[PDB]
UniProtKB/Swiss-Prot annotation, chain A:
Keywords: Capsid protein, Host nucleus, Virion
Assembly information from the UniProt record: Interacts with the major capsid protein/MCP.
GO BP terms, alphabetized: viral process
GO cellular component, one term: viral capsid
Stated family: Belongs to the herpesviridae small capsomere-interacting protein family.
UniProt protein name: Small capsomere-interacting protein
Species the sequence originates in: Human herpesvirus 6B (strain Z29)
Subcellular location, record wording: Virion; Host nucleus
Gene (name only): SCP
Physiological role: Participates in the assembly of the infectious particles by decorating the outer surface of the capsid shell and thus forming a layer between the capsid and the tegument. Complexes composed of the major capsid protein and small capsomere-interacting protein/SCP assemble together in the host cytoplasm and are translocated to the nucleus, where they accumulate and participate in capsid assembly.
The keyword tRNA processing belongs to this UniProt entry's keyword annotation: no
UniProtKB/Swiss-Prot annotation, chains B, D:
Disulphide-bridged cysteine pairs: none
Protein's recorded name: Large structural phosphoprotein
Quaternary structure and interacting proteins, as annotated: Homotetramer. Interacts with the major capsid protein. 180 tegument protein pU11 tetramers bind to the virion capsid.
Transmembrane portions of the chain: none
Span of the signal peptide: none
Superkingdom of this protein's organism: Viruses
Family to which the UniProt record says this protein belongs: Belongs to the herpesviridae large structural phosphoprotein family.
Annotated localization: Virion tegument
Post-translational modification summary for this protein: Phosphorylated at multiple sites.
Region of the whole protein represented: 7 to 275 of 858
Organism listed in the record: Human herpesvirus 6B (strain Z29)
Curated annotation (Swiss-Prot), chain C:
Subcellular location field: Virion; Host nucleus
Functional summary from the UniProt entry: Self-assembles to form an icosahedral capsid with a T=16 symmetry, about 200 nm in diameter, and consisting of 150 hexons and 12 pentons (total of 162 capsomers). Hexons form the edges and faces of the capsid and are each composed of six MCP molecules. In contrast, one penton is found at each of the 12 vertices. Eleven of the pentons are MCP pentamers, while the last vertex is occupied by the portal complex.
Domain of life: Viruses
Family: Belongs to the herpesviridae major capsid protein family.
Protein name, entry field: Major capsid protein
Residues of the whole record sequence present: 866 to 913 of 1345
Subunit structure: Homomultimer. Makes the hexons and eleven out of twelve pentons. Interacts with triplex proteins 1/TRX1 and 2/TRX2; adjacent capsomers are linked together in groups of three by triplexes, heterotrimeric complexes composed of one molecule of TRX1 and two molecules of TRX2. Interacts with scaffold protein; this interaction allows efficient MCP transport to the host nucleus. Interacts with capsid vertex component 2/CVC2. Interacts with the small capsomere-interacting protein/SCP.
């Protein structure tokens, strides 16, 4: 259960994204990997840029 | 933790056993012995293992090249001993020793091609010198000239170096029996160590070019199979498995595919 | 954008003459860009 | 048959398995394991514990120190490799390159100076940076290699040495392109093996000193509690258990308490 709280806390830390965007596939796949990090001193901005470039990779029409 | 494909519990142990004790078996050529590459099969014909054995052999060649680049010892020791003999003994004999030649020819025949020599004619000049010091005129057996009791053992040592360049030994020039003294023992040591050095480096570059050619070969097949589907996990596995690779890229890429193992396993159909 | 120093000694024909300890200094603008006209909107994000 | 005072067969199996696998598990330190001391406790609560856990810990610290002094690996192989790299390369290149042969290694002379190593590693940092680049700007790398892909692995290896000085591994070097040709051994491997050797010896002296101080403390407590009883076998047990101990004597003292185990168990209430 504690892992879900970590996922949701990281979701609000990234952008304050709404659960509606949490259901998005790019989020649905990467939130678990962002869970096994950000417990370190790494950054908050790095995760925003990572989500940016991954969401971009996802949408190549 | 030691990533492999949809693969069983016996073949994981056999692969990890081979890749761990890669140093001790002879003839390390993964191409030449087929007991491993045919073993890393998924099974059930062709349909249920084509893309999966493609990924699994990709991992196999990649970690073979990884353990190569992680486990090859330093050959610059044997080139250091080549520089020690070549510099100290023979130059002092040719100049300080007397009645030999001139500065420009001999000293630069030794000095030339410090880096990356494959030269046989320089070796032939030293073999002609030591043969002139010795008994006979022709150049039949020049490496330990005037004695053939060790020729088969030293050819066996060079063939064993070609087989397993990772575990190599230097035999020796024996002390009590010799045609001439310190000079001819220095020359025989110098020529054998030069042949050993160029043998180890050529066999190593052969295996490294083989492993890189196989990895770049399997990437195109893996990309051609994975290109068609349009799922996000599919195209992410496409990009991870289409990252370009070099020999100094392979270690970090193994660490990347370790963390990305959990997504491409689901991305495979 | 990062600044990089470059310490390099010269070609050996110029290294010879009591110039062995010379150490040229080159500053190379890593991952920046040339600029030719005064940026107005993005002054917050661009350093000359 | 490793006799323990009043314990369950489960707890005896715990302690015997702990001392059989002391070399294998990580963090070899008795203070780090709470379950070992809490499995050393005796039944029927604090009235039994106040006299018998003292003797039980007094057995366990002695046997910890005994298998500690018994299972010591020989640290002279890694110092032999230090002297190999040191004497073969770092003196001879100074003699070749005319750096007047500064004898910091001959200042150490011995594995008796666990001090005076860090200044020599800083001098080796200056040497490695000098031989890699002619700028001689004195820089602040931890290792002369300037290789940062494996500095984390070397630090993990040194922390593993700190945890398990009984079982250690040594981390070799790579060869795609070397900064120092053969000198990466003396410059980098010499710094790594020196830090490894001094770290193993400091961890060893730390654990052995802690074990002896705890044994002296348990002697003081146990004799203070058995001082009261004036029976004949009681003061016999006092004369057995009051004997002052140095680390050299603990093996013979364990051989004493094996034979006297039958009567001091009766002498305890």
């Amino acid at each position: 259960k504690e892992e879900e709280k970590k996922k949701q806390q990281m979701l609000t830390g990234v952008l304050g994204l709404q659960p509606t965007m949490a259901n998005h596939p790019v989020l649905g796949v990467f939130l678990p990997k962002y869970a096994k990090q950000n417990g370190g001193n790494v950054d908050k901005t790095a995760f925003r840029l990572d989500l940016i470039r991954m969401l971009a990779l996802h949408r190549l029409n | 933790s030691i990533p492999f494909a949809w693969l069983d519990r016996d073949k994981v142990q056999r692969l990890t056993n081979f890749l761990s004790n890669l140093e001790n078996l002879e003839n390390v050529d993964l191409r030449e012995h087929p007991y491993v590459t045919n073993s890393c099969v998924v099974r059930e014909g062709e349909d249920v293992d084509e893309l999966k054995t493609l990924y699994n052999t990709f991992i196999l060649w990649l970690m073979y090249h990884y353990v190569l680049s992680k486990r090859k010892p330093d050959y610059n020791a044997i080139w250091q001993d080549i520089t020690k003999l070549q510099n100290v003994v023979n130059e002092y004999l040719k100049s300080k020793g007397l009645n030999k030649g001139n500065f420009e020819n001999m000293f630069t025949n030794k000095e030339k091609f410090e880096s990356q020599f494959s030269d046989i004619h320089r070796a032939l000049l030293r073999l002609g010198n030591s043969i002139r010091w010795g008994s006979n005129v022709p150049i039949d057996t020049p490496y330990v000239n005037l004695t053939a009791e060790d020729s088969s053992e030293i050819e066996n040592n060079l063939q064993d170096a070609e087989k397993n360049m990772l575990w190599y030994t230097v035999y020796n020039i024996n002390d009590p029996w010799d045609e001439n003294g310190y000079l001819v023992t220095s020359i025989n040591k110098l020529v054998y160590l030069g042949k050993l050095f160029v043998t180890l480096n050529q066999s190593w570059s052969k295996l490294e070019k083989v492993a890189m050619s196989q990895i770049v070969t399997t990437q195109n097949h893996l990309s051609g199979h994975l290109r068609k589907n349009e799922n996000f996990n599919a195209v992410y596995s496409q990009r991870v498995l289409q990252t370009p690779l070099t020999g100094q890229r392979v270690e970090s890429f193994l660490k990347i595919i370790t963390s990305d193992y959990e997504i491409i396993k689901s991305s495979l159909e | 954008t990062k600044i990089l120093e470059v310490e390099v000694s010269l070609d050996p024909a110029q290294r010879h003459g009591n110039s062995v300890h010379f150490q040229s200094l080159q500053h190379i603008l890593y991952n920046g860009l040339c600029l030719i006209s005064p940026i107005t909107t993005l002054r917050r994000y661009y350093q000359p």
